[PDB]
Each structure stands twice: as C-alpha cells, then as structure tokens.
Amino acid sequence: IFDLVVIGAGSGGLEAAWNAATLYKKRVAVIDVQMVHGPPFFSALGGTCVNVGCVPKKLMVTGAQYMEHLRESAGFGWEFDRTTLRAEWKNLIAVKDEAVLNINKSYDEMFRDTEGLEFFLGWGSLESKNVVNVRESADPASAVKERLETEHILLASGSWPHMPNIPGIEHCISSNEAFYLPEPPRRVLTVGGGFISVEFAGIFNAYKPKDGQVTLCYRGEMILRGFDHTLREELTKQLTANGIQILTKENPAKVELNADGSKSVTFESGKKMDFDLVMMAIGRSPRTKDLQLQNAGVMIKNGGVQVDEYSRTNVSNIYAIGDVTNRVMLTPVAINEAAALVDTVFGTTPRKTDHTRVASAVFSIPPIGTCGLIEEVASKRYEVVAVYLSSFTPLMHKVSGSKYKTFVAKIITNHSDGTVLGVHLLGDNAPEIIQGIGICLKLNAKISDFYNTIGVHPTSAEELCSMRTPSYYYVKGEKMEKP
Amino acid sequence: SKIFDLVVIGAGSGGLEAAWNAATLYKKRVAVIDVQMVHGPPFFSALGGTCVNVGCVPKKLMVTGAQYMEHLRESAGFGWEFDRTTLRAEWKNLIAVKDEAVLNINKSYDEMFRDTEGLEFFLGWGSLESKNVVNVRESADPASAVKERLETEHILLASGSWPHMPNIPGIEHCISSNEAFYLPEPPRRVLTVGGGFISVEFAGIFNAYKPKDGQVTLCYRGEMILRGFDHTLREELTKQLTANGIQILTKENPAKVELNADGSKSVTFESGKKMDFDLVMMAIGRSPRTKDLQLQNAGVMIKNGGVQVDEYSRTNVSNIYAIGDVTNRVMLTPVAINEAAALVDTVFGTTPRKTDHTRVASAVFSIPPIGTCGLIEEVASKRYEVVAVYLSSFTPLMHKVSGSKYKTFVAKIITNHSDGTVLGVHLLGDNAPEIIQGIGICLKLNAKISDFYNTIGVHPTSAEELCSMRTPSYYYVKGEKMEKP
Numbered sequence: 001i002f003d004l005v006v007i008g009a010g011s012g013g014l015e016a017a018w019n020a021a022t023l024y025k026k027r028v029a030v031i032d033v034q035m036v037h038g039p040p041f042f043s044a045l046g047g048t049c050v051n052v053g054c055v056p057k058k059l060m061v062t063g064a065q066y067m068e069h070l071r072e073s074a075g076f077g078w079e080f081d082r083t084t085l086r087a088e089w090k091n092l093i094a095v096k097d098e099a100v101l102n103i104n105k106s107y108d109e110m111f112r113d114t115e116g117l118e119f120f121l122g123w124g125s126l127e128s129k130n131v132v133n134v135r136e137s138a139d140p141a142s143a144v145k146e147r148l149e150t151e152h153i154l155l156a157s158g159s160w161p162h163m164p165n166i167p168g169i170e171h172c173i174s175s176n177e178a179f180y181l182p183e184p185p186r187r188v189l190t191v192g193g194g195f196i197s198v199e200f201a202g203i204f205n206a207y208k209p210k211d212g213q214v215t216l217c218y219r220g221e222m223i224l225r226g227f228d229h230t231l232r233e234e235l236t237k238q239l240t241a242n243g244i245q246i247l248t249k250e251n252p253a254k255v256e257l258n259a260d261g262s263k264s265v266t267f268e269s270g271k272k273m274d275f276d277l278v279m280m281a282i283g284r285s286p287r288t289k290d291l292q293l294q295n296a297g298v299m300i301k302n303g304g305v306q307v308d309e310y311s312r313t314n315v316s317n318i319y320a321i322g323d324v325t326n327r328v329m330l331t332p333v334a335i336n337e338a339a340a341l342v343d344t345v346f347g348t349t350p351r352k353t354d355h356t357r358v359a360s361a362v363f364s365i366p367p368i369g370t371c372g373l374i375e376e377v378a379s380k381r382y383e384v385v386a387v388y389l390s391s392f393t394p395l396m397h398k399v400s401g402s403k404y405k406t407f408v409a410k411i412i413t414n415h416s417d418g419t420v421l422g423v424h425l426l427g428d429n430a431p432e433i434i435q436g437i438g439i440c441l442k443l444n445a446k447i448s449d450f451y452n453t454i455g456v457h458p459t460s461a462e463e464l465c466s467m468r469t470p471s472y473y474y475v476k477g478e479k480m481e482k483p
Numbered sequence: 484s485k486i487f488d489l490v491v492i493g494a495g496s497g498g499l500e501a502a503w504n505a506a507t508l509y510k511k512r513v514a515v516i517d518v519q520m521v522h523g524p525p526f527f528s529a530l531g532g533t534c535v536n537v538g539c540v541p542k543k544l545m546v547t548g549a550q551y552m553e554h555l556r557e558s559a560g561f562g563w564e565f566d567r568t569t570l571r572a573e574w575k576n577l578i579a580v581k582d583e584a585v586l587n588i589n590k591s592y593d594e595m596f597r598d599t600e601g602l603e604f605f606l607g608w609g610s611l612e613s614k615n616v617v618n619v620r621e622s623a624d625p626a627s628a629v630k631e632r633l634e635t636e637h638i639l640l641a642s643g644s645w646p647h648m649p650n651i652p653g654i655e656h657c658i659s660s661n662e663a664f665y666l667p668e669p670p671r672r673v674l675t676v677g678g679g680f681i682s683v684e685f686a687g688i689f690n691a692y693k694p695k696d697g698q699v700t701l702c703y704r705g706e707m708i709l710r711g712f713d714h715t716l717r718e719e720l721t722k723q724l725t726a727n728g729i730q731i732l733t734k735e736n737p738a739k740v741e742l743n744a745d746g747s748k749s750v751t752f753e754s755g756k757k758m759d760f761d762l763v764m765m766a767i768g769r770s771p772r773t774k775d776l777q778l779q780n781a782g783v784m785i786k787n788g789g790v791q792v793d794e795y796s797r798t799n800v801s802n803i804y805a806i807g808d809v810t811n812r813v814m815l816t817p818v819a820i821n822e823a824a825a826l827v828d829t830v831f832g833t834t835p836r837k838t839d840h841t842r843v844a845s846a847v848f849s850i851p852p853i854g855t856c857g858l859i860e861e862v863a864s865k866r867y868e869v870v871a872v873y874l875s876s877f878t879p880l881m882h883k884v885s886g887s888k889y890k891t892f893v894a895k896i897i898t899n900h901s902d903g904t905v906l907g908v909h910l911l912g913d914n915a916p917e918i919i920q921g922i923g924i925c926l927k928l929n930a931k932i933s934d935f936y937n938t939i940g941v942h943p944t945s946a947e948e949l950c951s952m953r954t955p956s957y958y959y960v961k962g963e964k965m966e967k968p
C-alpha cells in the first residue's frame with residue numbers, strides 16, 4: 001500500500017519523502033510524534049533543527065550578539081542612556097516560538113497539498129521487514145493507531161541528548177528544555193565542551209540578570225575537542241573576556257536541590273557550587289530503542305544503525321540516514337544523504353554522500369567556521385604539512401573597544417603539492433566566510449590558488465588570500481621551522 | 484652610472500607595495516615621493532595613499548558606524564529595550580576616532596621608511612624633468628623650487644586618481660568625498676550627485692548620522708543607480724535604500740548650484756526642478772592624476788585620461804612604468820597592489836608577471852551591502868551564445884523578526900550554459916562582502932555550477948543558498964531571454 005515509509009519527519013526524513021513523491025512519483029508515508037514544537041516531546045514535524053536545533057538556536061544567538069553591538073556602538077559615536085538597557089528573555093522566546101510555529105504549519109500544508117505524501121501522527125516501529133506500526137506511545141504495547149505495509153523503510157529518527165546517571169540528574173535539563181525556559185537563570189552551569197554548551201553559554205551570558213554568572217564546565221582540558229587548538233585557546237580567552245567562567249577538568253558528581261529551589265552541585269574534585277539551572281550538554285545519542293529494530297534484524301553498531309556508504313543497512317528493504325547513523329550530525333549532511341538514498345533506490349544512478357571536507361560553524365560569540373583537517377590528524381596522515389597562521393585584531397575592534405577580539409585564520413596544507421587540507425577561522429562572520437572555502441576544498445584548491453586570488457578590501461576574508469609563507473611545518477609528525 | 488634604481492611617484496597602495504618589494508626582495512635603492520606625511524587638508528592624501536587616507540579604511544569605519552543605526556533599531560525585535568528617546572549619533576566622535584586610526588597608519592609607514600635601508604621617502608610634488616631625472620618640488624606648480632633632483636634608471640608612476648568635478652555653474656559650492664571626511668558636523672539636507680559606489684556609500688553614512696529633520700537625497704542623471712552592476716541588485720538596492728529614508732532622484736541632472744543668503748545651496752536641475760540643501764557632494768567619477776607629472780618631458784602617452792600601459796604595466800617609453808588608478812584599468816586597492824608586485828618581479832626579477840584583471844571580486848559597502856565577482860548577464864549574453872541565470876531571493880529569518888522585512892537577500896549566479904562554468908556571482912544583503920571572497924577563489928578555479936550545488940552547505944547561513952541553486956530561472960540564447968516550457 002505504500003512504497004516508502006519514513007520513520008522521522010526531520011531534516012533527512014522530509015527531504016527524502018519530498019524528493020521521492022515529487023521526483024520519482026512513488027507514494028510515501030512519514031511518521032512523527034508531534035505536529036507543532038514544544039513539550040512533551042519537543043521535536044515535531046520539521047525535526048530537531050527546525051524545532052529545538054539550528055533555527056531557534058540561530059535566532060537566540062543573533063539576539064545575544066546585540067549585547068555586543070549595543071556596547072560597541074559607543075566607539076563609533078552612538079550615545080544613549082545605557083542605564084535603561086534591559087534584555088527581555090520572554091520577548092525573544094515569544095518571537096522564536098512564532099518563527100518555529102510558522103515552519104511547522106508550513107510543513108503541514110506541504111502534506112495537505114502534495115499528492116502521494118501522507119503524514120501519520122504517532123510513534124513508528126518495525127513489526128517486520130515490510131510492516132511499520134504507528135502506535136500511540138513509545139511503549140510497544142500501546143494501541144496500534146495505523147499499520148502500514150511498505151515496499152521500503154527509511155529510518156530517520158535522529159538523536160536525543162545523553163543525560164549521565166549521576167545522583168540528582170532529575171534536577172538538570174538538556175538543550176530541549178533550555179528553549180522553553182520561562183525566564184533567564186541568574187547562575188547557570190552548562191556542562192559539556194561541545195558546540196551546544198558553548199553556544200548556550202553565549203546566549204545565557206547575554207540575557208542574564210544583573211548579578212548573573214554563566215559557568216561552563218568540561219571534564220577535558222580545553223573546550224571544543226575536535227577543533228583546531230589555536231581556535232580552542234583563543235575562543236576560551238574571548239569567552240572568559242566576556243564574563244563566562246570556564247572550569248576545565250571539572251565534572252559534576254551530584255546535584256541536589258537546596259531549600260531555595262537552587263541546586264548544589266558537587267564536582268568530582270570535591271568542589272561545591274550553587275546554580276539556579278544546570279544544563280547537561282554532554283552528548284547526543286542515536287534514538288534507536290523505540291524503533292524495535294530487532295523485529296526486522298536491523299543491525300546497530302556503536303549506538304547507531306549500521307549502514308554502508310550508500311545508507312543501506314543489512315536488511316535490503318530498510319535504509320537509515322541522518323543522526324541515527326552517527327556519521328556527521330549536521331542538517332545539510334542529513335539532507336544530502338536523504339537525496340543520495342532516494343536516488344540510489346528509486347533512481348537510476350547510485351549516489352552516496354561525501355562526508356569529508358564538510359564545512360561547519362560554531363555560533364559562539366565570536367563564531368567559528370571550519371572546513372577540512374586539523375593539523376593533529378593532518379600530520380598523522382601526511383609526511384610534510386605546512387601551517388599558515390594569521391591572527392590580528394580587526395580595525396573595527398580597535399575602534400569599538402573590544403580589543404580582545406582577535407580574528408584567527410589558519411590554513412593547513414600538504415606541503416608536498418600545496419593542497420589545502422583545512423581552513424579554520426575564529427571571528428565575526430566566520431560561518432559566512434567558510435562556505436566559499438568549502439567549495440574550494442571540494443575543487444582541491446592549492447595554497448597558490450588562495451594567494452593568487454585578489455582580495456576584497458576591506459574585509460576579514462581577504463586575509464585568506466594574503467597568507468603566502470608557512471609559520472611552521474610538521475615533518476613526520478615533528479614540528480619544524482625554517483631558520 | 485647614477486644613483487636610484489627606481490623612483491616611485493606616489494606612496495599609495497601600489498607605490499608602497501612596489502617600493503617595499505624592490506628594496507627588500509631585490510635589494511634595490513628606491514626613492515618614493517608623496518605630497519604629505521599625514522592625512523588631511525590641504526592635499527588630503529598623504530603617505531599611504533587614497534585608500535588609507537581618504538578611501539577604503541576611513542569609509543569602512545564610517546559605514547560600520549552607520550550600520551549601528553540598523554543594529555540599535557533591530558535589537559528591539561529580539562527583546563532589547565532602552566530609552567530610545569535618548570539615542571543620538573555623535574558625528575564628531577566618529578571623525579575623531581577615524582582620524583586617530585588613519586594617523587596611526589600614517590605613522591607606521593613613516594617608521595617603515597626609517598627602518599628600511601635603501602628605501603627613501605621625499606616629501607614634495609614629483610614630476611619628470613626627462614625620462615631618467617625626477618624633480619621633487621615644493622608645489623604642483625612646475626616653476627616652484629626644486630627641492631630634490633633624483634637621477635634614476637627606472638620610474639614608476641603611481642599617482643592615483645582625483646575627484647572629477649563637472650564644469651557646471653556653481654561647482655565651487657559643492658564638495659567631493661575628500662572634504663566629506665573632515666566635515667565638522669553632519670549635513671541636515673545633503674545631496675550626493677552620482678549613482679556610483681562612492682555616492683551610494685556616503686548616502687548611507689549621512690543617513691545614519693543626519694540630524695533631526697535631516698534628509699539625504701541621491702540624484703543620478705541616468706535611469707538607476709550603480710550602472711555597471713547587476714540589474715536585480717540595482718533595482719533591489721534602490722528599494723532598500725528608499726525604504727530606509729534616502730530619497731533617490733533618478734533622471735535628474737544638476738544645471739547650476741547657487742549659494743543662498745543664509746548659506747544653503749539651491750540646486751536647479753535641467754528639468755526646472757529646484758531644491759535647497761546644506762551640503763552638495765559631487766561623486767560623479769574619479770580621473771587619473773597625470774597633469775602635474777609633466778609626462779611630455781619623457782614622451783609618455785596618455786590614452787583616454789590615463790597613462791597608457793601594456794599588460795605588464797610598461798608605458799610606451801622604456802624604463803618608465805605605471806600602475807594603479809593612473810592607468811585607468813580597475814580602480815581598486817588590491818588590484819594596484821597586485822600590479823605593483825607583478826611589475827617589480829618583471830623588471831628586477833627573472834620571470835615576467837602580469838595581473839589578471841578578469842574575475843576580480845569587489846564590494847559596495849552600501850547598507851545593505853553588495854558583493855560581486857565576474858560578469859553581469861548583459862555582457863555575458865553578448866559574449867556567450869547560451870547563458871543560464873540562477874536567481875534566488877529570500878528574507879533572512881533574522882529580518883523576518885527584526886522588523887526589517889524589506890531586507891531581501893538576493894543571490895544570483897550566471898553561467899556559460901554550454902559547459903556550466905560560472906561566469907559571475909552577484910549578492911545583495913548582510914555580509915555579502917565577506918561571502919564573495921571565497922567565491923572569488925572559485926571563479927579563479929573555473930568552478931562549474933555543479934561544483935557549487937554539490938558542496939554541502941553550512942546551516943544556518945545566507946551563503947549556503949549559493950549551494951542550493953540547481954535550476955536556471957531563465958536563459959539568454961544569442962542575447963534573447965528564453966525559458967524552458
């Protein structure tokens with residue numbers, strides 16, 4: 001009765017569903033737990049990105065950057081009674097809510113108007129290789145609302161926050177509830193060193209009350225493992241310069257709520273500190289459990305569904321894309337894989353996603369843009385590696401007062417032939433600058449291609465066309481320098 | 484034998500690049516001449532050139548300042564509140580911090596001269612006595628006192644350009660962009676004459692710093708502002724500038740300017756229309772500065788205003804070269820720098836080098852800005868038999884909530900449809916100058932439209948839209964616009 005059933009109406013799910021029903025005119029059903037965003041299940045039609053991810057995150061980080069603009073405007077002659085300045089968290093949450101709601105509604109119309117595309121509200125799970133059930137709860141004993149027999153199944157359930165099993169974890173929230181907070185915490189602890197932790201630390205820092213403090217803690221020695229160490233070091237200094245406390249090598253042991261409703265957090269070290277809110281942004285896990293993957297023999301490996309490079313699992317009827325495969329957890333990668341799967345299945349030529357050289361950003365204040373390898377893995381994979389590093393205070397920040405805002409640009413090459421293996425940026429607009437650079441690496445550009453291009457002046461991005469001489473090299477993993 | 488290896492007239496973007504490279508890479512003794520040590524009246528430009536003193540660097544600081552009017556207004560849609568009745572822009576503070584920023588670069592070029600052996604700076608007006616002697620005199624007047632007589636084996640002409648004032652009655656009541664950088668306080672009614680980037684950028688600056696019942700008017704004698712840019716970006720930018728309070732008078736042409744008794748200027752246009760302003764700024768074009776050089780003493784040819792050069796920047800006279808704005812090729816600082824470095828390699832180095840002037844990316848810092856690289860469709864469709872135009876315009880979600888819902892982002896890619904090669908990319912919207920730099924490297928790489936849409940986007944940005952354009956909106960076959968049925 002159906003050709004494709006997609007469990008999950010998110011970035012990858014909705015893309016594959018549309019791409020199939022429209023381009024190959026095959027009939028598909030998609031399942032999701034909610035129509036509109038918000039509690040109880042948070043994610044809804046549209047997926048994590050639309051509901052509790054990229055889109056609301058970006059509105060909130062933009063709102064948080066206005067603390068920067070409003071302070072820095074003074075260096076250019078804008079005066080106002082700065083004592084009347086107030087950040088109003090619920091005006092931001094209200095506009096965010098409306099913006100997300102309109103995208104949920106939009107997706108509903110898309111089903112109501114595209115023939116051959118049917119949405120089913122509920123929880124999908126595998127009854128067998130060819131039958132998917134839409135039950136009414138995550139529990140596999142709830143009333144089967146619909147039973148769908150299909151010629152193909154795509155799993156696109158995404159991921160979900162991972163909460164540690166520590167005493168008092170019920171007094172903690174994840175990023176999901178952080179999108180619905182009624183008012184901004186006075187003392188908030190954000191646990192984790194990845195992009196979600198770093199981004200929410202910037203958001204809370206801007207909308208915090210008069211005597212507020214944001215603390216970020218990470219169990220390792222520097223935030224953002226997996227990123228370039230110069231960028232990690234420099235972003236730490238700029239985040240602490242903007243009033244965020246960063247506690248590294250610290251990890252919560254227990255959380256117990258005090259009389260006030262505040263939380264006392266005891267760290268593994270014995271340190272004890274009180275906060276009004278504790279957000280765990282420790283990690284995200286593929287959500288496989290409710291799919292009942294054992295009922296069709298779909299194999300999972302490290303928490304996520306095992307798929308081959310064409311997103312097929314081990315049961316030929318079923319495929320999986322997006323976060324549930326645990327490859328690169330980014331919306332554009334899920335959308336890319338979804339189009340590549342519908343082409344390999346219902347099209348003529350098999351397409352597979354290239355997962356290397358994907359550009360991405362961290363929307364911290366200041367932001368990061370990055371594409372390619374970091375020198376630590378580059379020197380492991382190549383015999384001689386050149387590192388070109390440039391760091392400068394942009395002139396607007398000499399004038400704005402924010403003299404600590406160093407822009408960092410770093411290019412890494414295979415020095416034997418000049419191929420750019422990675423470009424890493426910290427500074428304003430770095431997410432916008434890295435997109436063109438992602439196209440360059442996909443075209444296998446060499447460093448001579450960068451410095452033979454004429455620069456757009458005055459911009460930060462022209463620095464990338466002005467890096468001609470390496471700062472140091474890695475020869476067989478050893479750092480070396482020209483004398 | 485005789486003394487300098489190179490004398491450079493003009494210590495600006497190209498002159499200082501050429502001078503530096505020859506003295507350090509090639510160990511040549513180089514003399515560089517310019518008329519002032521630090522920016523400002525009377526000669527405006529000085530050590531560093533036009534970009535540093537009265538060009539790129541001061542105007543980007545003033546446009547960043549103007550942009551805060553946007554930020555301060557738009558902050559309210561995200562919940563920021565303050566007593567908006569206390570808000571004022573203090574022009575004098577903006578000029579004071581711009582002056583310090585430019586002064587500090589003037590001071591470091593000076594230090595650079597003190598620190599480099601074989602690089603000498605001479606303060607004065609340079610001109611040719613013959614093809615191997617350069618005079619440094621006290622003023623532009625060819626008969627003023629010779630302050631230095633410099634014998635040389637090679638001469639580089641890097642004198643830049645200057646505002647072109649039209650000969651209309653009353654022009655002496657108008658200023659150019661040079662004086663606009665030193666105005667004591669902001670004009671209440673200002674007219675900027677011209678439809679090019681300098682007129683449009685300053686319109687945005689004046690609009691943000693105008694007083695209480697201030698009005699900025701831009702007039703252009705042709706049909707639409709920014710002739711030479713992409714037509715959608717021209718239409719759209721006119722819409723967005725108008726939406727922010729700038730009045731644009733297209734197809735209006737000034738006949739005369741006269742000074743009213745109170746000090747205001749009265750402008751009568753050729754259509755009989757007449758208006759009063761407190762300041763009238765001419766920004767109708769810039770011309771090569773060749774007059775004072777006394778080029779006829781060496782026999783250097785001039786063609787359509789500028790010094791005639793070949794692709795390697797050699798004039799018709801051996802051992803005399805010219806780069807930058809005086810050659811009237813592409814009047815942009817990075818182009819002048821590139822030419823300078825190619826020229827010193829050709830002359831003192833072993834391998835001849837020339838600048839590629841095609842596919843140069845550039846920006847207009849209007850509010851909102853423009854980023855552009857390559858061909859606009861009207862010239863591409865005349866050079867190529869089939870051209871595909873991909874067009875995408877959308878309101879960034881940020882502006883759907885900030886209140887400025889008129890701030891449409893426009894991304895346009897035009898290709899040679901026979902092989903998919905991207906011929907031009909044109910962008911209007913926030914951060915478009917920063918986005919276009921990476922695209923400039925792609926055009927130099929001869930990227931195809933498939934290489935753009937096969938790149939995974941960075942989400943959420945405006946730039947990822949350039950990776951989402953798979954289908955042409957329309958086409959140009961032998962110059963006529965056609966569409967798929």
Ligand SMILES: Cc1cc2nc3c(=O)[nH]c(=O)nc-3n(C[C@H](O)[C@H](O)[C@H](O)COP(=O)(O)OP(=O)(O)OC[C@H]3O[C@@H](n4cnc5c(N)ncnc54)[C@H](O)[C@@H]3O)c2cc1C
Pocket residue numbers: 007008009010011012013031032033034043044045046047048049050052053054057122123124125156157158159175196287290291321322323324328329330331332334941942943
């Ligand atoms: C706070 C945060 C910030 C992020 N920011 C960015 C960013 O800036 N840029 C970026 O590119 N990525 C970002 N991401 C990651 C991005 O959101 C994901 O990579 C992307 O959503 C993955 O798409 P997907 O198709 O894999 O799943 P999703 O969008 O996660 O879709 C999953 C769908 O499955 C549904 N579901 C689950 N199980 C079932 C079931 N059994 N039955 C029915 N429905 C079910 C869910 O309800 C869901 O809506 C962010 C994520 C988070 C949490």
Ligand SMILES: Cc1cc2nc3c(=O)[nH]c(=O)nc-3n(C[C@H](O)[C@H](O)[C@H](O)COP(=O)(O)OP(=O)(O)OC[C@H]3O[C@@H](n4cnc5c(N)ncnc54)[C@H](O)[C@@H]3O)c2cc1C
Pocket residue numbers: 457458492493494495496497498516517518519526528529530531532533534535537538539540542607608609610641642643644660681772775776806807808809814815816817819
């Ligand atoms: C308002 C404005 C905005 C601009 N904005 C941008 C921008 O954002 N980006 C961009 O890339 N370009 C911009 N430009 C253009 C850029 O400034 C020029 O293209 C660049 O300066 C040209 O370099 P040059 O070496 O040709 O000459 P210049 O930098 O113009 O140097 C010429 C020097 O010669 C001197 N001189 C002249 N005649 C004599 C003589 N006879 N003797 C001695 N010295 C002499 C001067 O005093 C001067 O300082 C802008 C220009 C203006 C005016």
